[PDB]
Enzyme design. Sequence first.
Site, PDB file in Angstrom:
ATOM      1  N   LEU A   1       0.832  -1.342  -0.024  1.00  0.00           N
ATOM      2  CA  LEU A   1      -0.146  -0.115   0.093  1.00  0.00           C
ATOM      3  C   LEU A   1       0.961   1.283  -0.059  1.00  0.00           C
ATOM      4  CD1 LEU A   1      -2.794  -1.054   2.629  1.00  0.00           C
ATOM      5  CD2 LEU A   1      -2.854  -1.530   0.351  1.00  0.00           C
ATOM      6  N   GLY A   2       2.139   1.038   0.062  1.00  0.00           N
ATOM      7  CA  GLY A   2       3.212   2.164  -0.156  1.00  0.00           C
ATOM      8  C   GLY A   2       3.606   2.600   1.127  1.00  0.00           C
TER       9      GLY A   2
ATOM     10  N   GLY B   1       3.728   5.649   4.776  1.00  0.00           N
ATOM     11  CA  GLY B   1       3.339   6.733   5.338  1.00  0.00           C
ATOM     12  C   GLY B   1       4.005   7.062   6.694  1.00  0.00           C
ATOM     13  N   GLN B   2       3.503   7.725   7.536  1.00  0.00           N
ATOM     14  CA  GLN B   2       4.064   7.934   8.705  1.00  0.00           C
ATOM     15  C   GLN B   2       4.552   6.802   9.533  1.00  0.00           C
ATOM     16  OE1 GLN B   2       2.937  11.871  11.418  1.00  0.00           O
ATOM     17  NE2 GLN B   2       2.458  10.027  12.413  1.00  0.00           N
TER      18      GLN B   2
ATOM     19  N   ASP C   1      -3.214  16.368  15.089  1.00  0.00           N
ATOM     20  CA  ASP C   1      -2.709  16.438  13.761  1.00  0.00           C
ATOM     21  C   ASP C   1      -3.860  16.076  12.914  1.00  0.00           C
ATOM     22  OD1 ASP C   1      -0.667  17.099  12.034  1.00  0.00           O
ATOM     23  OD2 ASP C   1       0.144  15.065  11.716  1.00  0.00           O
TER      24      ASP C   1
END
Length: 252
Positions: A14-15, A17-18, A127
Amino acid sequence: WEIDPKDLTFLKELGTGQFGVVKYGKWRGQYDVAIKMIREGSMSEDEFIEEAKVMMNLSHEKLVQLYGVCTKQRPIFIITEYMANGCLLNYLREMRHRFQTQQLLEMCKDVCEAMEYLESKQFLHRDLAARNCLVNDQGVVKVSDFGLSRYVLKFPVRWSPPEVLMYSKFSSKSDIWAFGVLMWEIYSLGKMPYERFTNSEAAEHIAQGLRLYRPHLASERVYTIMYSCWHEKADERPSFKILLSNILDVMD
Ligand SMILES: *C(#N)N1[C][C][C][C](N2N=C(C3=[C][C]=C(OC4=[C][C]=C(F)[C]=C4F)[C]=[C]3)C(C([N])=O)=C2[N])[C]1
């Protein structure tokens, strides 16, 4: 609760991220899960795993659910609800979608429902932004990474109220301001807030009082809602309960 990694199957990338690599898979062939693998040194692990016990007690139809953790290895995994259409910022940017403003107002409604739930539990997101929002196979927006900025070891200047920029004053009213910027992000179809400015230039303007222009897709009734999030006096900013009521009025 310690999910055994033998129960987990990894099927799609899914690639990233954080905190790193994210994958799609199944838990014991039955359930669709998302697996975030935590890049070492990027997180305060003990503090996180501790809060993760209380984040699992949280539950709302518009909040990305925590199925558990795998903190018996190197690196430690976080198991969650599978969101097929990924990050909202990319989902909005895909111009092919030809979204109706009613679909956009429903994206705000969804998020606001998750924020009213968090607010009632006295849980701060810290955030809130379209990058921390995910979309499922049905087009529903769910709030993700609620309070993970507390454990992160490049700051969200473009979503920060003036009291946070000059004094670091966080509250419900910091999430309120961030929500308003997120409503603008949605209606502006994934546009970067204060794009003409750098992080420091954008921070100076906000402290002085520059507000985000009305996105053309947003009606005056819509812009009134997001503009009420950007009050200089934090006490004058509405609660997520007030915002939701206003979204539902405009829905009609
Ligand atoms: C965007 N573009 N991205 C980056 C690539 C991965 C995509 N994706 N990430 C997740 C996802 C998000 C957060 C996870 O872990 C959580 C969630 C909530 C929380 F409070 C703490 C926490 F650690 C796990 C996975 C998904 C997904 N859930 O489907 C997707 N698609 C997004």
